[PDB]
Each structure stands twice: as C-alpha cells, then as structure tokens.
Structure 1
Amino acid sequence: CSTVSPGVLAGIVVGDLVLTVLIALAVYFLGRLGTAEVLGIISIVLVATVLKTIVLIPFLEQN
C-alpha cells in the first residue's frame, strides 16, 4: 500500500518527455523548409505533449 513513493516512476515521466524531444529533434535537424509534409512532426509532438500533460496533470494535480 503506497503512492507516488517509487519516485523513479516520476523519472519515467521526465524520461518520456526527453524521449519525444530527442527523436523529434533528430528528424527536425534534417528538416529545414523544403522536405514539406513537415506538419507530420508537429502532429506527433502535439499528441505527445497533450497525452502526458492531460493524463498526468489531473492526477498529479492536487484535486
């Protein structure tokens, strides 16, 4: 019987954020106005930010 005790789990949250940013940044590096369809990168970054943000805030948030 415990909660938010692991802490490492919190490390999982941080790890996820940097994960999306690292790979997303990798592709963005090559992209530079010319490859077109760049909107794709924005789409994935959008679902990622809102996914962690939406599921994590209402919970980690104090009521």
Structure 2
Amino acid sequence: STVSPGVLAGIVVGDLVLTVLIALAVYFLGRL
C-alpha cells in the first residue's frame, strides 16, 4: 503493498505545512 508509514507521514505533513503557508500568504496578500 500500500504505502509505507514514513512516505505517508511525509506526504501528509508536507501537505498540511503547504496548506498553512498558502493560507498565511492569502491572508497577508489580502492585507494589501
């Protein structure tokens, strides 16, 4: 087979951190 536990965690934590970065950037670009 499915996915290794390390690959999944990396993908997901990566997904979420990116989600946060985008959210911050939308907020601040919205301050302009």
**Common fold: TM-score over 0.5:** yes
> Which structure would you say has the larger RCO, counting Cα contacts within 8 Å and 6 or more residues apart?
1
Structure 1 gap segments, 5+ residues each = 33-63
Bigger Cα Rg? 1
Deviation at 1:8, TM superposition (A): 1.7
Structure 2: tracts of 5 or more residues without a match = none
| Deviation sequence 1:25-61 (CA, Å, 0-9, x none) | 11111223xxxxxxxxxxxxxxxxxxxxxxxxxxxxx
CA distance in 1, matches of 2:3, 2:21: 26
What count of residue pairs does the alignment treat as equivalent? 31
Distance in 1 of aligned mates of 2:19 and 2:4 = 25
Q: How does 1:30-45 map to 2 (within 5 A)?
A: 30-32=29-31
Superposed displacement of residue 6, structure 1: 4.4
